[model samples]
Target: ELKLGYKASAEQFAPRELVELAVAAEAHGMDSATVSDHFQPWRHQGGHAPFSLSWMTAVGERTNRLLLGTSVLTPTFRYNPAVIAQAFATMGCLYPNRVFLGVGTGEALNEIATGYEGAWPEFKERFARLRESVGLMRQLWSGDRVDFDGDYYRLKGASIYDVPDGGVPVYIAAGGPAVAKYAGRAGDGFICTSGKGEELYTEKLMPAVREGAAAADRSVDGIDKMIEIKISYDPDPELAMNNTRFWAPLSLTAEQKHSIDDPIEMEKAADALPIEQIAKRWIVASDPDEAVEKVGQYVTWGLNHLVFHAPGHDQRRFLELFQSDLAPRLRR
Candidate 1:
């Protein structure tokens, strides 16, 4: 099934507004809605970071059919995998079959904001920790007593008593083919972003996933292929382009961004980025039909789930346009 979802970002809106948007997405006929988990927003001046677990739990109560989840939460840091297991297990009990868990390696900004003392590790270290976390979380969700002793984590005797029968679906977020492959091997779903161009998705990600699935003796068709497509569409063409500037920090070089730990500094760097660079990854269109065509590019690949992340603060407007114009043409 083509699950057209919505991205309700925690970094961009207050707790109330973000949850409201998830509810609105359901009302707008979106199949699912996911929120980003962040300790700090991309920008400091107008940034917001509502706790994702709290907000999504609230959304589960307010909506009936809309699948609720995190687009990507870093369970490797700030939270132990056991804690993640217990929390999501409880959520699963409350909202069975409607909740999914999306996880990835963390960012420096979130760690530093919480006063993490040690030097930030490299991606190899981060990836390993995430790999362990996924395994531990799955075990903890089994409802059987687990005596885990992994390299990064340990549990003498732990059990998630309230867990759902088979554990919740764990969707792994991947930036490259390696993680994408692991997603196919171990994850219930694979997650990535849009606008990296056709080759990365078609040539790299899809094949890597199949390779991993084959290695695991698993069928790739069973694993959910998900992508979040950044979009900016409004009545005024200029407004569509202008709104994307708020996310300029995303355009920063990996070294430049990975080094900065403060949101204020991040905001300053984003402010320095040129206008053209800001919207390169975004599908900025005044014409609704144009936005439709741009978003469909993700579907051309193997992404069975498409989550729309609109640029701008007033998400109500985006929600309105999505149901009336973008959603209908994109789905079915």
Candidate 2:
């Protein structure tokens, strides 16, 4: 079965608004909701970054059936893996099967602002740290006192006390083939964005995932494949295109987006681009059929979980239209 999810932008909405949106998503028949985890927004103008863990807990309390998760939280830096393990364990206990953990190597925009005077590590080091962090988190979740000594992190007798029955599912995010393969080998689920087009998904990402699973002697069929489909929908096409201006940084080259450490710097870089360029990465359409057709392409490409991100400020309109028109057609 194809699962439909809502994408909550922590960088765009306040904590309370995001929590309410999760609840609204549940009411609108969305199967799950994932929030972006960032300390700072991509663009400072109209951007609001809320603490995602707290927002997850709040949303969990308000919604019963909706699966709540972070789109990509970076446990490799500015966070202790043991603490993340404990926090998610507690959340799993609170929400049972309705909780999941999504993680990635992380961007400097979030990690560099923690008053750390050192330069950010290179991609190799960051990837290594991410792998170690996952290993440590898994050790803690096994309900045993973990004594781990890895290249990046060390834990001395750390155990998570509030774990649920099956433990939380960990979904690893990937922007490229390398991380896609890593995710396939290590993750219970895989998370990726659709910004790079169909070639990235078909030619590189999915094949790499399968290759990694094969290497690990695991079946790719058992792993969940999730993709965030960036969309801008409104009653007016022009309005939809205009709304996408808020996430202009998303249209930047991966090098540009990942290399920049400051949110203000990202904003400046995005400001130079035209609105049409920014809208290229987003599916801009006013019609529900258009949205469904666009999203269906991803499903055909082998992503079982479709997470829709509508960039407009009024999430209610999108939710209403989705529930009334789009979801039913997609379900059929």
Candidate 3:
């Protein structure tokens, strides 16, 4: 089944406007709402807007069925895993079964405040820290005296009293080969990148995740696999293409940033693409049928959870087209 969602540019909207969008999304039958987490703004040539999660609380208050999350906050950057455990636990307590946490190793753009420059920061060391974070989260969720000792984090006898009935599920982003395996072995779920297509997902990601899970003696069935797709909704097809370029993550490694022909042109397109065209690939915009067909490619490959990013266009209208037109077609 497809889990429909959109990323909220919460920092761009006023508090009241954010709530209104949440309501609109629910009214349009959205499954969940997610926002990015970072202190600094995602700036380009024009004016820049910082990332924010203040809308999480407001969104929690207004929507009942819609789940809320960060489409990943870097756990190792700002807060220790223990504190993250407490924060998620508290939110889980309040929302009951309606909260989820998506985390990643974090980007230099977001972690520079903490002095991480994103060089060869020792992949093994970072992965170790992530594993510890998971252990700490599970410990806090148990509601028993918890003490964790690791290279990165050391926890004393700490316990959270108001643990929810079922612990919050954690989803980790896996971009590299080793990291993808680590996610399967360590994370409750797997989250895919927006730009990568079927070959990588099936060949690289699936194998790694399954291998890790198998090594951990965990069942592969019922693993939550989610992909957050970028979409731009509009009438013009070229405009839609431009939109995809705007939100595209530009800081990929040299080897990892391969794309369609004309490398220089692609880079330039990325720099100058309109936000509307950028988001079009993931969500149904001017052509609902074509978007549905694109999404079917993922479904055929066994991707059940889909989170489409709705950046700046008419989210409610796009969501309606997605549910009423796109979903039914896919189900058939």
- Output the number of the lDDT-best candidate: 2
Compared with the true structure, what per-residue lDDT tens digits does model 2 show for residues 1-332? Answer: 58999999999998889899989999999999999999889988888999999989999999889888999899988888889989999999999899899999988888888764698788899898989999999888899998999997998887787788788899999988999999889999999997677899999999999998999999998998999989787768788889888888898888877778888899999899999898889988888888788888888888998898988898998899888878998886
lDDT of each: 0.88, 0.89, 0.67
Stretches > 4 Å off in candidate 3: 10-16, 44-53, 114-120, 248-285
What TM-score fits each model?
0.97, 0.98, 0.83
Off by over 4 Å in 2: none
Residue 44 of model 1: what lDDT? Answer: 93
The C-alpha local distance difference test score for the whole of candidate 1 amounts to 0.88
By lDDT, highest first, what's the ranking?
2, 1, 3
lDDT of 1 by residue, 1-332 (tens): 88899999888899999888999999999999999988999899889999999988999999999888898998987887898999999999999899999988778988877877789888898899999989988988878899999889999888888988878999998878888889989989999988777898999998898988999999998999889989998988888988888889888876666668899889998898888888888898988888888887777788889999988887999899989888888975
Tens-digit per-residue lDDT, 68-111, candidate 3: 87777777756678777888888888887778888876654445
Runs in model 1 lying further than 4 Å from the true structure = none
Cα lDDT for residue 161, candidate 2? 78
